[PDB]
Amino acid sequence: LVPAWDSDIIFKCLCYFHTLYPGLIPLETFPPATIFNFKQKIISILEDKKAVLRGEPIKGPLPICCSKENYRRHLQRTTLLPVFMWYHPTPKTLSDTMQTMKQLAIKGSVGASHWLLVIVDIQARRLVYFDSLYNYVMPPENMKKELQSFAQQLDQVYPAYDSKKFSVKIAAKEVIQRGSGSSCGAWCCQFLHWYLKDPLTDALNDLPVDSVERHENLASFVQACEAAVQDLPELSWPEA
Ligand SMILES: [Cl-]
């Protein structure tokens, strides 16, 4: 009784978050990033930011629902990439992950599929990894090491003025989404909103223990989001 946010409603919620926090670029979720290509996707966005900062053309392709001029403006302004990752345990490649996702979508079934969020905070030079199921993909200390290596590539790809290094944070210390099959999308957008309000958010440590109470507060958050996006344009990037 707090249902599944698909890629559509996650996208709209991100558009809405942009209008509150312009630094956030509302990256599309169709087709989404995966465990296999999220690094390439991020690198490619930051190379496009660098290009735009130099008045150069961009490479990486246009988002489907965004004009070229508007995308450039977003890339210029953005200080935060919300990368939504669609995962399933069975597929072993990008090609198979894509094929699996298309199969469950064309059946409208859920499966063992799951949303993760990686936040690239460019201002703070911080990678934040949020898994509402704690270790659905791999243990957190292993994700940490994998992301620290990634963080060193980003130091080369997107240097700071003073060689300040990208740091890594694993957000969830425990399973957050307790006894719920479907709430992973919503949790991702809740955590993102907390982070936009306060990048040093302790909101995950401050949760109620009671799983039901927790999911009621989330149901609140979800209704407030659904109200705010009701009138907002469909399949259409906000103008930066
Ligand atoms: Cl932006």
From Swiss-Prot:
The keyword Secreted applies. The active site is at H114, D131, C184. Its main location: secreted. It is a single-pass membrane protein. It is an enzyme of class 3 (hydrolase). One of its GO terms (cellular component) is extracellular region. GO terms for molecular function: cysteine-type deubiquitinase activity; deNEDDylase activity. Its EC number is 3.4.22.-. It is found in: Secreted; Host cell; Membrane. GO terms for biological process: protein deneddylation; protein deubiquitination; proteolysis. Induction: Expressed late in the infectious cycle. Keywords: Hydrolase, Membrane, Protease, Secreted, Thiol protease, Transmembrane, Transmembrane helix, Ubl conjugation pathway, Virulence. Binds to host NFKBIA. Belongs to the peptidase C48 family. Effector proteins function to alter host cell physiology and promote bacterial survival in host tissues. This protease possesses deubiquitinating and deneddylating activities. Impairs ubiquitination and degradation of NF-kappa-B inhibitor alpha (NFKBIA), thereby preventing NF-kappa-B activation. This is Deubiquitinase and deneddylase Dub1. It comes from Chlamydia trachomatis serovar L2 (strain ATCC VR-902B / DSM 19102 / 434/Bu). The chain holds residues 162 to 401 of 401 of the full protein.
